[PDB]
Amino acid sequence: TLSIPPSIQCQTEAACRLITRVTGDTLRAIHLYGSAVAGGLKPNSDIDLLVTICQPLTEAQRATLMQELLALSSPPGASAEKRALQVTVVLYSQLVPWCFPPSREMQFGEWLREDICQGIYEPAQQDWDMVLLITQILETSIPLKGERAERLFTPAPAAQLLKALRYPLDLWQSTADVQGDEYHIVLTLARIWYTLSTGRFTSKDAAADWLLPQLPEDYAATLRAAQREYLGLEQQDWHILLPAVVRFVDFAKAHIPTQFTGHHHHH
Ligand SMILES: CN[C@@H]1[C@H](O[C@H]2[C@H](O[C@H]3[C@H](O)[C@@H](O)[C@H](NC(=N)N)[C@@H](O)[C@@H]3NC(=N)N)O[C@@H](C)[C@]2(O)CO)O[C@@H](CO)[C@H](O)[C@H]1O
Ligand SMILES: Nc1ncnc2c1ncn2[C@@H]1O[C@H](COP(=O)(O)OP(=O)(O)OP(=O)(O)O)[C@@H](O)[C@H]1O
Ligand SMILES: [Ca+2]
Ligand SMILES: [Cl-]
């Protein structure tokens, strides 16, 4: 261990074999990461995969990969036997040596099903979240193909990890920026706050529990509602809660650290 949860082994092997067959000789590695390995696998959770390749895929490779991942993935919650897949593809040359912000070659996920069905695919593009993804994989991941992460990737400088953690925080500003993703944003803000304060990464649920006793009660109530929905215990009316979510976002913007809290950098 680390270990692949038995309940996802079959689908994870099928995804691995598809990605291997389509990418052929450009494939460098495939890593399983996220809550399946780090903890907190819930009924709606996806299976998170990072695919490292040497050269860009042809349009043929990309089209085949997208269409066949549609058949291997299901919408979150539709099935207990066939989960949503999230597959991010990255060029090795964006990570070794690092390019900041790094780009991602391709992204599959269920939120893109309607577009992907019609052959509409996001182009390669810069994404600061890749710094966070590789940082998490260096701590907790399983190589399904290729080498263990610590033999393949190198840590980003703290200065760049700081920028990657604060980029989404600065970008959430208006009601429309958060509508449709209320509990997800509230919980991700708790995770960002936890990482900047401790230098560590933790699950959505554990980050909420870490932050709750530190908040004034009004902000603790919004965080509790987000946590309780994520845990399956009650679905809120987020239209009614939107003004309090906006206040929570602004409180986090005002209070989250602007540099790692040092002896508490990520190591
Ligand atoms: C890349 N992961 C997906 C992606 O996650 C994003 C998410 O991104 C959403 C933004 O938070 C949200 O503000 C934005 N809304 C507006 N621009 N109005 C959403 O569009 C954005 N979602 C998205 N781009 N799919 O929040 C980031 C912290 C993320 O987890 C990084 O991985 O989108 C989520 C749906 O929104 C999916 O559940 C995730 O699987
Ligand atoms: N400090 C942080 N700690 C962890 N993830 C963070 C942090 N800041 C931003 N994120 C980003 O939030 C996303 C978390 O991915 P995802 O929603 O799949 O979560 P998960 O932990 O696997 O839980 P789930 O079981 O709900 O899928 C990633 O894009 C990750 O890089
Ligand atoms: Ca996940
Ligand atoms: Cl778990």
**Same domain, yes or no: 120 and 223:** no
Residue nearest to atom 1 of ligand 2 (CA): 192
User: Within this chain, do residues 132 and 186 fall inside the same structural domain, yes or no?
Assistant: no
Task: Return the ligand 1 atom nearest residue 46 CA.
Answer: 40
Q: Are 143 and 30 in contact (CB under 8 A)?
A: yes
**Residue 155 C-beta-side C-alpha neighbours within 13 Å:** 9
Residues 31 and 128 in one domain: yes
- Cα dist from 233 to 228, 236, 266, whole Å: 5, 10, 33
Q: Are residues 26 and 147 in the same domain?
A: yes
Please return the burial class of 71, using the count of CB atoms within 10 Å of its CB with bins 0-12, 13-18 and 19+.
exposed
The angle formed by the CA atoms of residues 173, 177 and 178, to the nearest 5 degrees, is 100
Residue 65 C-alpha to ligand 4 middle, in angstroms? 29
Structural domain containing residue 261: 157-267
138, 178: one domain? no
> Do 241 and 165 belong to one domain?
yes
Q: 112 φ, ψ to 5°?
A: -105, 10
**Same domain, yes or no: 10 and 114:** yes
End position of a domain, from candidates 156, 191, 220: 156
Residues 91 and 166 in one domain: no
Answer for the pair 80, 43: CB distance below 8 angstroms, yes or no. Answer: yes
Query: What does the block give as tokens for 61?
Result: 């490779």
**Final residue belonging to a domain, choices 114, 129, 156:** 156
Of ligand 1's listed atoms, the one at least distance from the Cα of 88 is: 1
**262 in the same domain as 186:** yes
Q: Answer with the one of 112, 140, 156 that is the final residue of a domain.
A: 156
Whole-Å CA distances, 51 to 104, 106, 163, 207, 223:
10, 10, 24, 27, 33
Return all residues near 194 (Cβ < 8 A) that are at least 6 apart.
200, 201, 202, 207, 210, 211
Q: At what angle do helices 182-198 and 217-230 cross, to 10 degrees?
A: 110
- Tell me, yes or no, whether 15 and 139 share the same domain: yes
45 lines ligand 2 (CB under 6 A): yes
Q: Which residues pair with 86 in a beta bridge?
A: 48
Say yes or no: 75 and 97 in one domain.
yes
Same domain, 189 and 120: no
Q: Where are the beta strands (DSSP E) in the chain?
A: 27-33, 47-53, 85-91, 103-104, 106-108, 125-126, 142-145
Residue written as tokens 């206040």?
247
